[PDB]
Amino acid sequence: EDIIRNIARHLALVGDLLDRSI
Amino acid sequence: SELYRQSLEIISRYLREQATGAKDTKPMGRSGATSRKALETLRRVGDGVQRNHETAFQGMLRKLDIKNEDDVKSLSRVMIHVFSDGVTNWGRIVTLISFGAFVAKHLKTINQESCIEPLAESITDVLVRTKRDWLVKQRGWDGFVEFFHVE
């Protein structure tokens, strides 16, 4: 699950940045 | 649960409309007023996420190598890992649904359209099974609409 974990970290960052702006 | 079925109504409709370009005109369930508004919110916010992060999403999709229904499971695992730091917010939730729509488009493109509903239900299951209490506290899909409302 190395690939899955890195994808998740990337999506978490995108999601948090989006949440920040709202 | 009612929350599962309402979440599935929203997420399945968004994924299928994104993949096929065709709106689902069939009537919604008893929470349809909220579901219609949540779908309208996703069309704005989720379409934006996919376009603004298209290059990243393409690379993620390539690494997942999604070919058939046996691979649909990988998205549920991504979602579980996203939430593994104990943080939940609407930005993460909409980003995961938006990536789900991006994958749904891919599934249509590779003529695996039959995998889209399983994908939508898999996403719904992770969200509702593991975040029910958070969703309820946030007033569910009404809270989602309110959070992303502009002006």
Side-chain angles (χ1 to χ4, degrees), chain A residues 1-12 14-16 19-22, chain B:
Chain A
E1 295 204 314
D2 296 67
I3 290 288
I4 283 164
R5 276 194 257 94
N6 182 74
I7 292 171
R9 288 203 287 153
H10 201 330
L11 292 172
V14 170
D16 285 351
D19 205 77
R20 160 169 73 181
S21 71
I22 308 258
Chain B
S1 68
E2 291 295 316
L3 178 59
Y4 186 103
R5 284 183 290 277
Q6 181 185 30
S7 300
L8 180 58
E9 165 172 89
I10 294 161
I11 294 169
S12 174
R13 284 172 186 250
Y14 184 59
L15 266 54
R16 286 182 291 109
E17 182 182 315
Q18 286 284 294
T20 68
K23 279 201 185 175
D24 186 348
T25 69
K26 293 190 294 298
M28 290 168 137
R30 266 179 46 99
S31 295
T34 295
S35 296
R36 278 172 234 122
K37 287 180 145 51
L39 251 186
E40 295 166 351
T41 299
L42 275 172
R43 292 182 186 114
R44 173 167 45 90
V45 177
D47 291 24
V49 169
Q50 291 177 71
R51 189 169 48 258
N52 289 335
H53 303 278
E54 181 176 273
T55 296
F57 279 15
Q58 286 170 351
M60 298 168 182
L61 179 63
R62 182 191 31 91
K63 291 176 174 163
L64 292 173
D65 192 28
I66 294 170
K67 302 173 297 310
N68 55 60
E69 211 174 291
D70 299 338
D71 303 321
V72 160
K73 179 215 165 155
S74 65
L75 282 289
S76 73
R77 295 302 303 166
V78 169
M79 292 178 68
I80 290 162
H81 283 281
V82 164
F83 295 127
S84 67
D85 67 350
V87 173
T88 310
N89 60 52
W90 288 120
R92 289 180 177 203
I93 289 166
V94 80
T95 295
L96 291 163
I97 294 165
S98 301
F99 186 62
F102 191 86
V103 174
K105 292 171 171 170
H106 163 78
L107 290 169
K108 174 63 164 64
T109 297
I110 65 164
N111 293 293
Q112 296 289 325
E113 185 173 359
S114 63
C115 292
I116 293 171
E117 185 68 22
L119 172 63
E121 201 161 353
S122 295
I123 294 170
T124 299
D125 178 63
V126 170
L127 185 59
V128 175
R129 187 162 46 73
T130 76
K131 299 299 184 192
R132 178 199 68 200
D133 292 336
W134 187 91
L135 293 167
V136 171
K137 174 174 278 288
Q138 301 304 323
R139 283 176 308 102
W141 290 103
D142 290 313
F144 170 85
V145 171
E146 291 174 25
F147 183 74
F148 287 114
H149 175 64
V150 184
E151 112 202 276

